Design a protein around this ligand. Structure first.
Ligand SMILES: *[C@H](O)[C@H](C[C@@H]1CCNC1=O)NC(=O)[C@H](CC(C)C)NC(=O)OCc1ccccc1
Ligand SMILES: *[C@H](O)[C@H](C[C@@H]1CCNC1=O)NC(=O)[C@H](CC(C)C)NC(=O)OCc1ccccc1
Lengths: 303, 303
């Protein structure tokens, strides 16, 4: 038993990380088959970054302006192209470590593993949820751009995130691997703010089920509630409304524990209205919303 | 910026995980050069596990009783031996993916990455601290034994933990890679309890410095305290005493922030005596003690 925030094993992605240098700018790229993907702002200079015109900037580049390094081996760039906010550099070598992969775009409320990288070299792995306001709460320093986020399903890597920037609140923004930003953000050095966020209700309930599966039961009660009466409370506390599809997604956890979803919603209502009174749930004094129902089932089915 | 609990990239260890089966028992092993390491209780049966005599049990085994699988390739066992609570199986093939490695034993208060595995296949990665009572707070189901814990330093993997069992409180116990248990535990199915735990004071202060580096400053104050007067408060709240070596270890973080250690100790004293009054620190409503000073420096020096 036990419940821990857990990343996917990162080996398959570590074999894809390279270093991309253009001018005095160095960041990370993703080498799949004979293409390297990286943030297009690698071609910017300090002054270009206030309001660059990337079509102009790229036209003024040629293949020899891009230095790609896969460990010690330098890869020869034989083509370059822009796809939205990502640059695609064709190289003279197919990555022999290319896994089965897909490019997928994730929804707010879903999770993925981030492999933080610097100078083409992986440094650490951790889990993130895409917030309702299309930001993630990550850990990224200068040089981390081009680090990617991903999920793994039966040795197929679904890439969903490439890192591009940090907002003033300390949260992080980036694109899918088609180079389309998550959220209303742009890759230039101007004042940008995340919209207001909300709490992911279905994830909180999933984590409450994880708590019960692991022996935390103090917050349970005999009451049930209706979907409508719960959603009235949710709106008050800046929680997303619960839909019948969310109840259905929680079905398997409801079955394993014998606690109906609307039974657990009564617990959440009382937790929202009364707090915890000094107690904790799975070691947290706060209600956690960064675990999906799938994340919970992944750790808890064997208990 | 940003501060996240972060595992080491797990690729180098994923290339070492195999599956070890004996009788109806299957768990994980660690394949380095031509030796596979696994928990010795793989040789037990359901009834052996109450109070096994492992020397007897091993003498009654031979090489052909052990089935080792590295993916689809079956490895031939050519020798077996016991080293304390781990079994060493010599196989006919050196692992071509063997990294530079060491076997190290860690101290309470230190952290490491756990690569959770099932049937020889990695499933997820996360960070653990060795508690003062020699347990870890992990996530392990049936079949996870032989999963290992490790740190990485300049492409050298220091292995420090192999998983063996779960205690009744839901916490986890195991050995170093020499097969010597952390703590006063034994590998048999009897009633065993962890001693009382304490909070790792130097880690809490390290996390407070991480908070300041990331812009959380509300808990700071103008006061300083003495080491003796702090340790009087620490004893009251079940915190470990702070030593001059702990102040020294925190030196670099103290320098980066311009906040002396005994200056931060005054903050911690007030937090212990007054709580947070509804506020959070790096997104936590509780004081966190699972980050070492090294873990913090690793993420925060570039800020
Ligand atoms: C790319 O490596 C870098 C990642 C930033 C650097 C600090 N934390 C991150 O996530 N991205 C940028 O530097 C980005 C480039 C623009 C052309 C989009 N700008 C940016 O993030 O500015 C915000 C910032 C905040 C704090 C420190 C440095 C930059
Ligand atoms: C080895 O795979 C297994 C790991 C346990 C299983 C559940 N969570 C874990 O960490 N170890 C054992 O099963 C261990 C074997 C003895 C011979 C040492 N016994 C054990 O952990 O018993 C406690 C237990 C608690 C909850 C479920 C199952 C077993």
């Amino acid at each position: 038993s036990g419940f821990r925030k857990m990343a996917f094993p990162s080996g398959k992605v570590e074999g894809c990380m390279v270093q991309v240098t253009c001018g005095t700018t160095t960041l990370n790229g993703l080498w799949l088959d004979d293409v390297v993907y990286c943030p297009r702002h690698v071609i910017c200079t300090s002054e270009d970054m206030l309001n660059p015109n990337y079509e102009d900037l790229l036209i003024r580049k040629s293949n020899h302006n891009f230095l790609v390094q896969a460990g010690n081996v330098q890869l020869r760039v034989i083509g370059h192209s822009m796809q939205n906010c990502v640059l695609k550099l064709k190289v003279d070598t197919a990555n022999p470590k290319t896994p089965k992969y897909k490019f997928v775009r994730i929804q707010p409320g879903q999770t993925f593993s981030v492999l933080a990288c610097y100078n083409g070299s992986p440094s650490g792995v951790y889990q993130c949820a895409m917030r309702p306001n299309f930001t993630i709460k990550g850990s990224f320093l200068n040089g981390s751009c081009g680090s990617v986020g991903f999920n793994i399903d039966y040795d197929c890597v679904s890439f969903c995130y490439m890192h591009h920037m940090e907002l003033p609140t300390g949260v992080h923004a980036g694109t899918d691997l088609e180079g389309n930003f998550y959220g209303p953000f742009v890759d230039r050095q101007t004042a940008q703010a995340a919209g207001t966020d909300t709490t992911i209700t279905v994830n909180v309930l999933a984590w409450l089920y994880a708590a019960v599966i692991n022996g935390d039961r103090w917050f349970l009660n005999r009451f049930t509630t209706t979907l409508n009466d719960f959603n009235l409370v949710a709106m008050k506390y800046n929680y997303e409304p619960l839909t019948q599809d969310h109840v259905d997604i929680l079905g398997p956890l409801s079955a394993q524990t014998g606690i109906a979803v609307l039974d657990m919603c009564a617990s959440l209502k009382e937790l929202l209205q009364n707090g915890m009174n000094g107690r904790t749930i799975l070691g947290s004094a706060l209600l956690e919303d960064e675990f999906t129902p799938f994340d919970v089932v992944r750790q808890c089915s064997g208990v």
